[PDB]
Structure formats: C-alpha cells, structure tokens
C-alpha cells in the first residue's frame, strides 16, 4: 500500500507450469510463499502470519520497472503499461510492449546418466528492468526480503537463478493515490486474487479477468515425498472489476498434511 520494493534479478526462472518455459513476472503467491519459507527458517512465520492475516498486510505481484513502475494491461476498456501511460491506454492508441526480459532457453545435462537432458528457460532482464512488489512497509517484511536477496526467487535458485538486489523505495504519487482495497467503481486487481464465495458471486458478473491456474507442488520438510497442491484457479494481474472485492489466503494443503499451504490471493486494487 505504502512502499514499493525493487527486485533486480539479471537471472530468473519463474516457472509457468514447466521447466521448459519461464515468465517475466511472478504472481504474488510465489513471493508470499518465499517469505513463508524464509520465515519458517529463522523461525518467525508465526509473527509473519499474525501480520499477514491482517488487513494491513497487502502484497502484490511483480510488474516490470524500467525507470518507473509498470502496471498490467487492464483487460478490457481499450503486456504492460508504465503508470504515465495507463490514462492514455484507457483512451488507447498504441503501447506496444518493449523488451524487459529476453526469455532464453538452455539445454542442460546430467552426465553419464540415462534420461538426463532437461531444458531450463530463463528470463534474462535487460540491464535496467526490475520487478517491484508493492507491500505495506513493515520491518518484519524488510528482514524477510533482505534475505530473499540472497536466497533468490522462483526457479532453480540453487543453480543460480532468481537472485536479486532489494532497493526499497517510496511509491511515486498518482500510483499511491490509486491503491484502494475498498472502492466501489471501475477497479483493477494488480494481484492474482481469489474472492470470498458470496463476494465471488458479486465478482463474476462484470469482471474482465483471466484465470491462469496457480498449482503444482508443496515444498515441505515433513513428508519425504512430494505431494501435489490443491490446484487453485485464481484471477489475473489484469482483471478489471466493478465494486472491489475481498480475497482469501486459500489453504491448499494436500489433504491429510502436517502443515498449511497458504497460497496468498487477496487483492490490492487500482482505480480507473
């Protein structure tokens, strides 16, 4: 709400459902699960969840940062837009997407083995592009993300991916004025949110979203076996709505599991 972070990667894998395909942003439950796995170690996640369950805790997925903050294309009412261009895009002439990251793909190996060729895609950022989560300024979050500097984000992360440099900044105005979370007019979820149920019936009627399917494993220390998550369909970073809704933190534990698998989907919005 109050303080945009800055992640400067220069090497990152961000998943997309495979290893052969990566994506240049990372869909806010990834950064929230990174913080949960960073507060599970240095054991602190009870404080981070008593903070996180509050309505003070907002969090927001990454958008590019090339000399200024970007926002998604709002889906409907005629790919990213700088904040200077969003009002001109709601008139809409041409805002063709420049290069933020080049998505390379490299074949790798496990030498002297039998089915050993895997292929890792990689967003290689173009020497100025950063990714900027927007979250509420809090010291616990700063101790968490200043060590996610050195643990990394997203992909392989122990083979040298997703490792950044955090450069916490104030939010520039005309982007702080339009983060609302309780509005009643033409609004845009710049997170990937999942509404509460009756609130979701309120959400579907004139919401212009994508769906995008957050899924596809639980990272644990208590199974010695990899169990699939509960395959959560969500909304997109575009996803215009009317009458701003209220999201969840959807427990997607693979049933009969020792702990919770949280999958942050509650929205910070953008007025338009």
Partner 1 sequence: KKEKIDLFYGALLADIGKVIQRATGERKKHALVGADWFDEIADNQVISDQIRYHMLAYITYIADNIASGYTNQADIFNVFGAQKRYFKPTVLNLKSKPNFASATYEPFSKGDYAAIATRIKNELAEFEFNQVQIDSLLNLFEATLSFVPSSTNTKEIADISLADHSRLTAAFALAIYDYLEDKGSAFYEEEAFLLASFDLSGIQDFIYNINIATNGAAKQLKARSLYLDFMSEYIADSLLDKLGLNRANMLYVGGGHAYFVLANTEKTVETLVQFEKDFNQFLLANFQTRLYVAFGWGSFAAKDIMNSPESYRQVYQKASRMISKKKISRYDYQTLMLLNRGGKSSERECEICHSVENLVSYHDQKVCDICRGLYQFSKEIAHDHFIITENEGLPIGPNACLKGVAFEKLSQEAFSRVYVKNDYKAGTVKATHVFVGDYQCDEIYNYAALSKNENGLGIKRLAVVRLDVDDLGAAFMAGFSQQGNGQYSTLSRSATFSRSMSLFFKVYINQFASDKKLSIIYAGGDDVFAIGSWQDIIAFTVELRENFIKWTNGKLTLSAGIGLFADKTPISLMAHQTGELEEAAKGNEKDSISLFSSDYTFKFDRFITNVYDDKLEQIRYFFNHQDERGKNFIYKLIELLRNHDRMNMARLAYYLTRLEELTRETDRDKFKTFKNLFYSWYTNKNDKDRKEAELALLLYIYEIRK
Partner 2 sequence: TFAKIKFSAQIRLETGLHIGGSDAFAAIGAINSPVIKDPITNLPIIPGSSLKGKMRTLLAKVYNESDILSRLFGNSKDKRFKMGRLIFRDAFLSNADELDSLGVRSYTEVKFENTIDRITAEANPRQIERAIRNSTFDFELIYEITDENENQVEEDFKVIRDGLKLLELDYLGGSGSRGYGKVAFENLKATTVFGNYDVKTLNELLT
Q: Which residues sit at the interface with partner 1, rule CB under 8 A?
A: 17-18, 20, 75-76, 107, 115, 117-119, 194, 197, 200-201, 204, 207-211, 213, 215-216, 225-228, 230-233, 250, 254-256
Interaction of residue 56 with partner 2, rule CB under 8 A: no
Task: Count the Cβ atoms, other than its own, within 10 Å of residue 229.
Answer: 18
- Which residues lie closer than 8 Å to 47 by C-beta, 6 or more apart? 39, 140
- Name which of partner 2, partner 1, none residue 104 binds, using a CB cut-off of 5 to 8 Å depending on partner kind: partner 2
**Whether 121 contacts 130, CB under 8 Å:** no
Interaction of residue 18 with partner 2, rule CB under 8 A: no
Which residue among 124, 181, 243, 259 contacts partner 2 (CB under 8 A)?
A: 124
CB of 75 to partner 1, least distance (A): 6
- Name which of partner 2, partner 1, none residue 213 binds, using a CB cut-off of 5 to 8 Å depending on partner kind: partner 1
**Length of the chain measured in residues:** 272
CB of 80 to partner 1, least distance (A): 18
Only one of the segments 24-32, 83-91, 154-162, 203-211 lies at the binding site for partner 2 (rule: CB under 8 A); that segment is 154-162
The interface with partner 2 within residues 191-250 (CB under 8 A) comprises: 219-226
CB of 19 to partner 1, least distance (A): 9
**Whether 57 contacts 50, CB under 8 Å:** no
* CA atoms of 210 and 75, how far apart (whole Å): 8
Three-class SS state of 265: strand
* CA atoms of 85 and 87, how far apart (whole Å): 6
Interaction of residue 108 with partner 2, rule CB under 8 A: yes
Only one of the segments 1-9, 119-127, 130-138, 176-184 lies at the binding site for partner 2 (rule: CB under 8 A); that segment is 119-127
- Name which of partner 2, partner 1, none residue 50 binds, using a CB cut-off of 5 to 8 Å depending on partner kind: none
Interaction of residue 271 with partner 2, rule CB under 8 A: no
* CA atoms of 77 and 93, how far apart (whole Å): 12
Kindly provide the residue ranges of all beta strands, DSSP E only, lying in the chain, ordered along the sequence. 3-4, 70-72, 80-82, 101-107, 119-125, 134-135, 169-170, 187-189, 240-241, 248-249, 264-265, 269-271
Interaction of residue 138 with partner 2, rule CB under 8 A: no
Q: Which is nearer to partner 1, 130 or 214 (CB)?
A: 214
Which residues here bind partner 2, judged by CB under 8 A?
11, 41-43, 102, 104-108, 110, 120, 124, 126-127, 143, 146-147, 149-152, 156-161, 163, 219-226
């Amino acid at each position: 709400t109050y303080k945009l972070y800055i992640m400067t990667f220069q090497n990152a894998h961000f998943g997309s459902g495979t290893l052969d395909s990566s994506k240049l942003t990372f869909s806010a439950d990834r950064i929230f699960s990174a913080l949960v796995l960073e507060a599970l170690k240095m054991g602190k996640l009870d404080a981070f969840l008593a903070e996180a369950n509050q309505d003070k805790f907002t969090l927001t997925d990454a958008f590019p940062f090339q000399f200024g903050p970007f926002l998604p294309k709002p889906i409907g009412y005629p790919q990213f837009l700088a904040l200077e261009n969003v009002d001109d895009y709601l008139n809409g002439e041409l805002f063709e997407n420049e290069e933020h990251a080049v998505i390379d793909t490299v074949t790798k190996n496990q030498p002297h083995k039998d089915d050993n060729l895997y292929q890792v895609a990689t967003t290689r950022f173009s020497n100025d592009t950063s990714l900027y989560v927007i979250a509420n300024e809090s010291d616990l979050l700063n101790e968490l993300m200043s060590s996610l500097q050195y643990s990394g984000l997203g992909g392989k992360r122990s083979s040298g991916f997703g490792r950044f440099e955090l450069d916490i900044q104030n939010i520039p105005l005309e982007l702080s004025d339009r983060l609302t979370k309780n509005h009643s007019d033409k609004v845009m979820s710049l997170t990937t949110a999942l509404p509460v149920d009756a609130d979701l019936e309120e959400a579907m009627e004139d919401g212009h979203y994508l769906l995008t399917k957050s899924s596809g494993f639980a990272f644990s220390h208590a199974t010695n076996e990899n169990y699939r998550k509960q395959d959560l369909y969500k909304f997109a970073s575009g996803s215009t709505f009317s009458k701003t809704f209220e999201g969840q933190i959807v427990d997607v534990r693979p049933l009969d599991f020792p702990h919770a698998v949280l999958n942050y989907a509650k929205p910070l919005f953008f007025k338009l």
